Design a protein around this ligand. Structure first.
Ligand code: HEM
Ligand SMILES: CCC(=O)c1ccc(C(=O)O)cc1
Ligand SMILES: [Cl-]
Ligand SMILES: [Mg+2]
Length: 393
């Protein structure tokens, strides 16, 4: 009843151009079986949304990677928020929701916006830049470690550790085993900065520790929640901002619409998250036998969700392969959906908005003027290098 496909969604050829294989996965049926890895797959919007909003059947406490925590040891202690289910998930989620709250955004907005303005003006003085290293990486590195309250020493471990984290959600292919092998120095740096004495008061990390007073998390839970922000809050925004610049460089008509109304900056970033989906895939594990799309999935089966594919499903989106900065983007699953929907989404949108705002006001054109290089990751989609010319407005 369920089609069996040999597509490997964690192969380099898939990463290089996933869109044809993603249509094949969508059009094969609402639920497929991937013989390469012995997992179920869902690539249409309807089933991806359905699975995300059914947490009691499609759980996260057995891992959101390919590995089943009931069968193998997690490569690091399980995340208290990402790799937990209600009710254990709820109070740690509430802490991160308050730490990264709308109220908190007010305290960082001016510095985040000023840093974005300064970066774009700095890059315009150079003319020909790398939009990844000099922008998509440089800007988040200039604001997010500070906002976490991290010390200066050791920040060079942050992007390598995040790449390891997201490669580890994948199957035990070379990308994953290369990342986990000899990863101890990255783990040691991160785990050390998660301890309260190393976090600047007033920053995100110290505020998590401050919530141990409330009864919402214990002192021994706070370092692991600091770890969550250091795992999920940097590389994702790097790929998201790079995707937005990539979209504006490819769709000059949309850059010009953004220039003419910089208040479209926030939705221009949101559409970039839908269009490129920095987080492409992750898993759930069935807690019971379950019917999904006419398909009977047994207990303890891994289900792979294609977020990027769901964000391009023509069953849901008109002209899904067009970047449209006035598209009604509400409902895309680039940040997930349901109880686990990205708790740092306000931080991501703040960075993206103020960067695209700076571009909208200061830049007249963005022209690719060098070889474009893709960055390969089992779960993250993004570029390694994006040489562009910036023309000042
Ligand atoms: C463009 C940027 C980002 C994207 C595309 C993104 C994507 C996602 C997605 C798809 C999920 C859901 C995972 C699941 O359902 O299993 C998620 C969860 C999460 N994200 Fe983000 N994220 C971004 C930025 C951030 C930032 C800036 C932070 C922290 C400052 C962050 C921290 C987290 C955490 C802690 C979770 C776990 C939430 C939970 O399980 O309840 N992310 N993210
Ligand atoms: C889709 C994966 C993701 O974005 C993420 C990764 C790690 C953590 C964590 O360490 O809790 C949370 C979310
Ligand atoms: Cl770690
Ligand atoms: Mg010390």
């Amino acid at each position: 009843t369920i089609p069996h496909l040999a597509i490997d969604p964690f192969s380099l050829d898939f990463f290089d151009d996933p869109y044809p294989d993603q249509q094949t996965l969508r059009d094969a049926g609402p639920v497929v079986y991937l013989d390469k890895w012995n997992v179920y797959g869902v690539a249409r919007y309807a089933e991806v949304h359905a699975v995300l909003n059914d947490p009691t059947t499609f759980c996260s406490s057995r891992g959101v990677g390919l590995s089943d925590f009931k069968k193998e040891k997690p490569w690091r202690p399980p995340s208290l928020i990402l790799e937990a289910d209600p009710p254990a998930h709820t109070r740690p989620r509430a802490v991160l929701s308050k730490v990264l709250s709308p109220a908190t955004m007010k305290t960082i907005r001016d510095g985040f916006a000023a840093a974005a303005d300064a970066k774009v003006d700095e890059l315009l003085q150079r003319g020909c830049i790398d939009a990844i290293a000099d922008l998509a990486e440089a800007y988040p590195l200039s604001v997010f470690p500070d906002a976490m309250g991290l010390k200066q020493e050791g920040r060079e471990h942050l992007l390598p550790y995040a790449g390891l984290v997201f490669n580890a959600f994948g199957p035990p292919n070379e990308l994953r085993q290369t990342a986990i092998e000899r990863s101890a120095p990255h783990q040691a740096y991160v785990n050390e900065q998660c301890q309260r004495p190393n976090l600047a008061p007033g920053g995100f990390g110290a505020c998590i520790h401050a919530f141990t007073d409330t009864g919402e998390i214990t002192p021994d839970e706070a370092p692991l929640l600091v770890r969550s922000l250091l795992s999920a809050g940097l590389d994702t925004t790097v790929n998201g901002i790079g995707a937005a610049v990539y979209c504006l460089a490819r769709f000059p008509g949309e850059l010009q619409r953004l220039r003419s109304d910089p208040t479209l900056a926030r939705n221009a970033f949101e559409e970039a998250v839908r269009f490129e989906s920095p987080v492409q895939t992750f898993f759930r594990t069935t807690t019971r036998e379950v019917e999904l799309g006419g398909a009977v999935i047994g207990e303890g089966e891994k289900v792979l969700m294609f977020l990027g594919s769901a964000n391009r499903d023509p069953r849901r989106w008109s002209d899904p392969d067009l970047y449209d900065i006035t598209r009604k983007t509400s409902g895309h699953v680039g940040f997930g959906s349901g109880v686990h929907m990205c708790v740092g989404q306000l931080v991501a949108r703040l960075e993206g908005e103020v960067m695209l705002s700076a571009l909208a006001r200061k830049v007249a054109a963005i022209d690719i003027d060098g070889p474009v290089k893709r960055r390969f990751n089992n779960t993250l989609r993004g570029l390694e290098s994006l040489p562009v010319k910036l023309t000042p407005a």
